[PDB]
């Protein structure tokens, strides 16, 4: 419990000497035991699905619970959690004159949440009747909405 | 500035998928407000050390700080010890040289609040007001007058 | 901000108001309908409460002499005196259950000496109990003071 | 009698005492302001000052900070009563003070103000009380869960038996002013989407710019706007963003004004969304009964809607513990009365003085307005020790 | 035995039925004081 | 006990799966502990009878 | 980097939960050494360069 901690506070005096590709990626100080014990397979018999759909549902319902429960050291997924995946075509990029830097820029702009303020704000005018929170851009949800980025 | 939906998945949810691999735990709860304010509670077993039940939590949270905004990062994130209730509540007023409920809140938090909170094991202090700040109230008519933005 | 064509300087004051005000106007406290701020201290989850409250005054006392004109401390909602009442009304009850026992010891035995042995046989046992709870971990609790009367 | 004087005697945990310090909270309806709730905290300050001079020494109210959470809807007035000597009767003690306070705030008011006791304890262990919670186990949303929680609050107060008292925690559900920015309209005229977002964010809601130094200490610098240019929906079009072609463009160009229903307090339990259900055990039934007649109401709900109990309890005291405690307390008492005695017969004399001293203990508790809490439970165990004492003399000297 | 097995606390009611022991120290010190001393003082000085 | 509570979370998750999703148990330590008590406390009793 | 090996762009929300957004390329334009010259970067003078 203490042999940890110190280690991840020493590591953390060296996080800003690194990339971001790495920083916003999962750094993790954990307790080790070279071996597994319980290994819970997860399959389908009826309503058939793929080795990809199953790995997502395992890590979007049960993996988050298990790992925190009754002192688990570290969990390893046997697959991967879902992600809005994009497969850029280099021929159709040159077709309209474009790069992967312009695609990335379009997602860090339209696929984003903003902190717009609120009507009847924090210091208002004495006598206002209402106070509601402003919404603006919302993070995209489905495959269709990421297909319609400008 | 952020609304309830915004903070629920730009800070709250990120911390929740990185709130694992911790020693001892009964449950985790959470609140996400329209004022742009989130606070999680990780409760532990009875008789557990509060000195170590901390720490781990703020080193797990901190593997998820660079997945967040800056609006939030440079804002005060705080892992602390809880006790749903107050005890000593020290009012601060004026009788002679009269001053405002704004001048007083600043002097309380620019002389005594910094001392109190560190003194003899205080969990967390809550100001009944706010510390001063160089506040600026932009006029949108006089911005368009010289052609300008915030 | 700018320099419009003809050499006219646009300043920050010319486009916006500038007052030294609070960073958060969301809350504002009154004390008997008077303008005020303060400090709502909350416990540190395993702290020594009343000694922590005695040292809240420790810092506050060194701060008193350097206030501006009018600034005075006041004490609403406060736990302290409840502890002072639970010792002074229990150690009082303690002494009432000796004086009372003394009378039952005299009404049955007119021997003054015989109503003395039991009068010293319990003050000593009371004290030994303090020394066991000191050497075990506990405190002078509301519970373990009623246990000295029972 | 010993049985009947015990089962019918109801079970508490700890009494709610006069602590010389109580409090009272405020809460306003859908989207009220600081000016609205301040009128309420003002009316509350009167009851304790003008209509309660003898009992209240001071008040300490706060505008926009409930013990639910935060916002301009809420409030709280901490109270610090006069010393105990100057408050003589039951009338002038917390219970009665918060009684006629709750009447006055339900009489000449038009929102939600209460007053309440200050247990000691912590928040939990009300006894004949519970805290249910309702989870999104599947991939539903807020709109779908809202309805499921409406359906469990309904069926609860639709067949009670031996009634009950159910209610949510603080999900009031108010409107929200959304702004749809069309991206095609923006790029056409030549405006950066970055510039637009920090015009809307650093005007209406503020923005942390930089740190400066006032009078030795370092504080913050914030940027927003005068209040008069951000109080209504029509004031959005007064903000003119600049385009790349050096000409001004209003918000009315690319914006779209329209209201929408959301929530000002999204709660989540254990990595998934949730809503709190603060109910209270019936005045007839009690807890173990009420909670188990709430689990069959949550399994009758639709798909992808589970449940779990925050946060009540982890197995109680006059509940399932008390037994186990007494149980062993016997098996030792009898043994040790054999380590100094030998029979068998001697213990069974001492081992039924138990109900002698007990029927009296219950009589006084059941008779006066007291109950089986903690202090009473150990008043019992004290007396099996004092009955053994007395009896053991009857048995020791005689044998 | 009436006291300390009952003082095997269960959860949030930890130091509640637990803090007997407080009691029991008093019982075993009343035994001590009565096995020592009270014997002494009686002999030492009575009638 | 950590493996007993792996099933604790997993058990509350069972009822809300889609159609077809079923749990299975390969590589698992649990039953080796159950064999080392039931074949030792058995041996215990054999060394009394004997 | 964001074609051959992927790049962490941003976070989105699928079905309530927040997951990640990755950017790379179809497999068929990054399997051999000859496929590097099919990627045309843009220059400041608005014309493509392989
Ligand atoms: C002259 C006879 N000397 C004694 C010397 C002792 O030295 C100790 C050293 C230690 N070294 C540092 C690792 C620690 C941890 C505990 C000790 C206890 C102790 C152990 C179990 C339960 C309570 C206590 C105890 O005394 O608790 C409260 C005082 C102790 C007790 C007595 C009688
Ligand atoms: C006819 C007299 N009416 C009463 C009416 C009451 O209404 C209440 C409404 C509530 N509204 C929803 C926000 C909440 C939260 C608690 C209440 C309690 C309560 C408050 C403090 C400590 C314990 C309890 C309490 O009774 O706990 C277990 C039952 C209460 C108690 C009495 C006597």
PDB file of C-alpha atoms in Angstrom, chain A residues 24-25 56 59-60 64 81-91 93-94 97-100 102 104 107-108 111-113 139-141 146, chain G residues 2-3 6-30 38-42 46 48:
ATOM      1  CA  UNK A  24      -3.529  11.392 -22.406  1.00  0.00           C
ATOM      2  CA  UNK A  25      -2.929   7.667 -23.023  1.00  0.00           C
ATOM      3  CA  UNK A  56     -17.082  -4.021 -26.044  1.00  0.00           C
ATOM      4  CA  UNK A  59     -15.727  -3.552 -21.086  1.00  0.00           C
ATOM      5  CA  UNK A  60     -18.867  -1.357 -21.036  1.00  0.00           C
ATOM      6  CA  UNK A  64     -15.323  -1.264 -14.764  1.00  0.00           C
ATOM      7  CA  UNK A  81     -13.718  -1.484 -25.950  1.00  0.00           C
ATOM      8  CA  UNK A  82     -15.529   0.168 -28.875  1.00  0.00           C
ATOM      9  CA  UNK A  83     -14.399   3.406 -30.516  1.00  0.00           C
ATOM     10  CA  UNK A  84     -15.574   5.657 -33.357  1.00  0.00           C
ATOM     11  CA  UNK A  85     -13.080   4.253 -35.859  1.00  0.00           C
ATOM     12  CA  UNK A  86     -12.163   6.047 -39.087  1.00  0.00           C
ATOM     13  CA  UNK A  87     -10.266   4.585 -42.054  1.00  0.00           C
ATOM     14  CA  UNK A  88      -8.924   7.468 -44.175  1.00  0.00           C
ATOM     15  CA  UNK A  89      -8.654   6.893 -47.938  1.00  0.00           C
ATOM     16  CA  UNK A  90      -5.482   8.527 -49.367  1.00  0.00           C
ATOM     17  CA  UNK A  91      -6.834   8.571 -52.950  1.00  0.00           C
ATOM     18  CA  UNK A  93      -7.895  12.838 -49.888  1.00  0.00           C
ATOM     19  CA  UNK A  94      -5.866  13.886 -52.950  1.00  0.00           C
ATOM     20  CA  UNK A  97      -6.900  18.201 -52.020  1.00  0.00           C
ATOM     21  CA  UNK A  98      -6.579  17.283 -48.331  1.00  0.00           C
ATOM     22  CA  UNK A  99      -4.493  15.674 -45.565  1.00  0.00           C
ATOM     23  CA  UNK A 100      -5.022  13.734 -42.296  1.00  0.00           C
ATOM     24  CA  UNK A 102      -7.468  18.569 -41.903  1.00  0.00           C
ATOM     25  CA  UNK A 104      -8.197  15.684 -37.318  1.00  0.00           C
ATOM     26  CA  UNK A 107     -13.157  16.370 -35.359  1.00  0.00           C
ATOM     27  CA  UNK A 108     -11.522  18.645 -32.740  1.00  0.00           C
ATOM     28  CA  UNK A 111     -17.035  16.688 -32.124  1.00  0.00           C
ATOM     29  CA  UNK A 112     -16.638  18.791 -28.970  1.00  0.00           C
ATOM     30  CA  UNK A 113     -18.530  20.010 -25.888  1.00  0.00           C
ATOM     31  CA  UNK A 139     -20.376  15.435 -28.423  1.00  0.00           C
ATOM     32  CA  UNK A 140     -21.445  13.285 -31.391  1.00  0.00           C
ATOM     33  CA  UNK A 141     -23.179   9.950 -30.817  1.00  0.00           C
ATOM     34  CA  UNK A 146     -19.377  11.467 -37.836  1.00  0.00           C
TER      35      UNK A 146
ATOM     36  CA  UNK G   2      -2.034   9.348 -37.906  1.00  0.00           C
ATOM     37  CA  UNK G   3      -2.179   7.078 -40.985  1.00  0.00           C
ATOM     38  CA  UNK G   6      -3.125   5.810 -35.480  1.00  0.00           C
ATOM     39  CA  UNK G   7      -3.734   8.981 -33.478  1.00  0.00           C
ATOM     40  CA  UNK G   8      -5.780   9.797 -30.360  1.00  0.00           C
ATOM     41  CA  UNK G   9      -7.983  12.657 -31.612  1.00  0.00           C
ATOM     42  CA  UNK G  10     -10.924  13.196 -29.243  1.00  0.00           C
ATOM     43  CA  UNK G  11     -13.556  11.602 -26.970  1.00  0.00           C
ATOM     44  CA  UNK G  12     -17.193  11.014 -27.985  1.00  0.00           C
ATOM     45  CA  UNK G  13     -20.258   9.332 -26.409  1.00  0.00           C
ATOM     46  CA  UNK G  14     -21.670   6.007 -27.653  1.00  0.00           C
ATOM     47  CA  UNK G  15     -24.859   4.824 -25.924  1.00  0.00           C
ATOM     48  CA  UNK G  16     -24.396   6.789 -22.683  1.00  0.00           C
ATOM     49  CA  UNK G  17     -20.747   5.866 -22.052  1.00  0.00           C
ATOM     50  CA  UNK G  18     -17.728   7.922 -23.179  1.00  0.00           C
ATOM     51  CA  UNK G  19     -15.197   6.123 -25.393  1.00  0.00           C
ATOM     52  CA  UNK G  20     -12.420   7.176 -27.806  1.00  0.00           C
ATOM     53  CA  UNK G  21     -12.115   8.353 -31.420  1.00  0.00           C
ATOM     54  CA  UNK G  22      -9.225   7.037 -33.540  1.00  0.00           C
ATOM     55  CA  UNK G  23      -7.986   8.024 -37.012  1.00  0.00           C
ATOM     56  CA  UNK G  24      -5.793   5.857 -39.288  1.00  0.00           C
ATOM     57  CA  UNK G  25      -6.610   4.513 -42.798  1.00  0.00           C
ATOM     58  CA  UNK G  26      -8.096   1.545 -44.644  1.00  0.00           C
ATOM     59  CA  UNK G  27      -5.778  -1.457 -44.359  1.00  0.00           C
ATOM     60  CA  UNK G  28      -5.186  -1.599 -48.138  1.00  0.00           C
ATOM     61  CA  UNK G  29      -3.192   1.697 -48.179  1.00  0.00           C
ATOM     62  CA  UNK G  30      -0.592   0.744 -45.529  1.00  0.00           C
ATOM     63  CA  UNK G  38       0.300   7.249 -52.326  1.00  0.00           C
ATOM     64  CA  UNK G  39       0.008   9.752 -49.447  1.00  0.00           C
ATOM     65  CA  UNK G  40       0.028  13.333 -50.758  1.00  0.00           C
ATOM     66  CA  UNK G  41       0.837  16.049 -48.193  1.00  0.00           C
ATOM     67  CA  UNK G  42      -0.298  19.607 -49.042  1.00  0.00           C
ATOM     68  CA  UNK G  46      -1.935  24.949 -52.561  1.00  0.00           C
ATOM     69  CA  UNK G  48      -0.132  18.378 -53.693  1.00  0.00           C
TER      70      UNK G  48
END
